[PDB]
Structure formats: C-alpha cells, structure tokens
C-alpha cells in the first residue's frame, strides 16, 4: 500500500484554518467536495505524521495502534475521490455517504485514547514529564479530532434555512445556558433528589437592552456549558448535604468590542490553588455524562476563545468561556506538524 507515501505527502501541506464568516458562506457542494478532498487529506496527514513521532512504547499499545488504523482507512477512503469528476452528482453523494461512515469509524476515539493513557499510568507512571506529554499531545489530537468533525457535519448537515450545518448565526447564548442547566439538573435530580437553581444576569456593554446573540456552533456551547454545570451541581451539592440551603448557580453572560464571556459561580467550598492545573490534566483524571473539563477548554479554543477555572478554597468556584464577540476575529485554531 501507499498510505505512508500519503501520510508524507499530505503533511508537507499546512491544514487551512476557515472563519465563522467563511463557515456561513456555503458556494456550492462542489466547492465544499473540491475543498474537502484535498482538506481533510493534509489535516488527517498533519495528525497521523504526529502519532508516528509518539515513543514506540506508546505507539506499539493496542489502543493507539487501533486508532492509527482508522485514520489510515478514512485517508484512504478519501483519496478514492481525489481523480473523481464532481459535475457527476453521484461522486458528490457517494462522498456524503464516505465522510458518514468516517465519522462513525472516530465516534470512540476518547475513550479508545484513555484507555492507553490508563495502561501508561500502569505501565510507565504518572511521573510530571509523562503528564505534560501526554498533555501536549492528547490536547492537539483532540483538537484536530474537534476541527475534522467540524468540516465533516458542516458537508453532511447542509448538502443532504436558518441554521448552516452546526452553525447557528443567531444564537441566543442565554438560551443555551438554560437547556445545559435543564438537563444537568434533571440528571442532579435523579442522582441527588436535590439541584442548586439558576440565575442569568446578561451585560450588553453597548446595547444594555438588546439580549446577547452570536455567531456559534450551539453543540460546542452546550458541551461546555453541561461540563461546568456538572461540575457546579456536585459542587454545590455535595459541599450542602449537612445544610438545608442550595446556593444557586449564577451564570453571568457579558458582551463586550471582542469579547463574549459566560461566567458559571458557585458556592460549592472550592479548589486550593494548587490542585486547580490537574483539573485540566488527561493523566490525573484518568481513573479506572459530558466530554470532560480538558476537552470543554478544546472547544473554547478551537475558534480563539478559551475556558479558566479560579476557586476561592472554602467558599466555591469561577468558570468562565471566554469567546470571541465577532464572527471575523472565529478562525479556526489549529495544530500545525512543523519543526516544533
Ligand atoms: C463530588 O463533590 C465535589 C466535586 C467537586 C468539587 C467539590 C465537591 O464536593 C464538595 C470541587 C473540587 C474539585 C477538585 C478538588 N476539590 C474540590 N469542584 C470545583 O470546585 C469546581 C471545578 C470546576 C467547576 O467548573 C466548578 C467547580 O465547582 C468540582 C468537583
Ligand atoms: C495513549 C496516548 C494518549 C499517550 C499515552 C502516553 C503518552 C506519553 O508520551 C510520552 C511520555 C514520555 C516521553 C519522554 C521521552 O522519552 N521523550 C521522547 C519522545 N519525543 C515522551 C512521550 Cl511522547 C503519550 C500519549
């Protein structure tokens, strides 16, 4: 087979951060073809360059092995389509059919990849080194992984109108704060019979009336969103099972010239400043609802924004997401194969 030589020549490419802006544009399905089948080539290619650096005590695990495998038959599937003629609405649909099945294929990459982080500990350690390591590369992996998928709905939900694809123009974040609240206190309610209760405040700098909308993907909001509110609810709850008062959870949504920010407060007793970094760890919260702390800042980051955690030990905790206000300043970050 050739899927090295592929590998090695769609890494010599630098995968193409696209804007919010650019997201919304969409020309035709045979631009979104033409684009896609050279895109996702270089941005599989510029991953699976970076796998094959990891250690060969890494590498050689089942669980990394497993995952390679799949990105080597979703390259493969591609290329097929490489020489195609788009004009032939058959090459288009058959693709739709190809970036599905590809996105089935990943669907357990999370747990696939923490299982060998597990077997690591088990195996190596969780040493500092091993952590930062493991840090660097899983938050790159999953990054890519957030930023294929993207791409990949964006075709698949459009070429089968309010809404584009996963791209909501018109998204009321205050909206989105409440479903991530009302489905993280029915599961509070059925785990603890009791969940704190909610209070939005909303700070239009510019427009104190207007409420808060933007250009966002909803699903990457709420994945957040539900994350903190988790959080927040085991917090609050189980810091108050000796007391007879919930504190409420307080989210603040404030919009400033470049800055959406969506502040989630608690009172459930805090973090010391000290262990606030492991939250964030891949290792540390590896063990044996919703897509991990880790992985909530990914997303934030993905359009330049990002998520911070600051506690008050003994009185609770401050989560804010930190988006960008305009649709012009949400590109795509990236990671990037080069000498670094
Ligand atoms: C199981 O009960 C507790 C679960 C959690 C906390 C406290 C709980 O008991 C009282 C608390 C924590 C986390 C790590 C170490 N010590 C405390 N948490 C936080 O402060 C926190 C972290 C992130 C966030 O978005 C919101 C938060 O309130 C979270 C976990
Ligand atoms: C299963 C996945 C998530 C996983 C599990 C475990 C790891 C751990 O990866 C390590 C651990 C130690 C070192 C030190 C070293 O010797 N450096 C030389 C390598 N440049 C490098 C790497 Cl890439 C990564 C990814």
Redesign the pocket.
Known sequence: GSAPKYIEHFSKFSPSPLSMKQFLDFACEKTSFTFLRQELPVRLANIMKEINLLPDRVLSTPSVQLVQSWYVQSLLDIMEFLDKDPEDHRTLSQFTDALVTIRNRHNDVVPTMAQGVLEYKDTYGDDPVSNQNIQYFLDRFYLSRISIRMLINQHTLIFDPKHIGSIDPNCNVSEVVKDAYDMAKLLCDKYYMASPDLEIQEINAANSKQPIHMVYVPSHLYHMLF??FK??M??????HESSLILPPIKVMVALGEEDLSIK?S?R?????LR?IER?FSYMYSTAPFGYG?PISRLYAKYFQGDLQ?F?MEGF??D?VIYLKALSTDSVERLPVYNKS
């Not at 459930?268 to 010391?272: C, D, E, I, L, R």
């Open positions: 994350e903190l959080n927040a085991r917090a609050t709850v189980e810091s989630m608690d459930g007793g805090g973090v010391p262990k939250l702390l955690l506690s609770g905790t989560a």
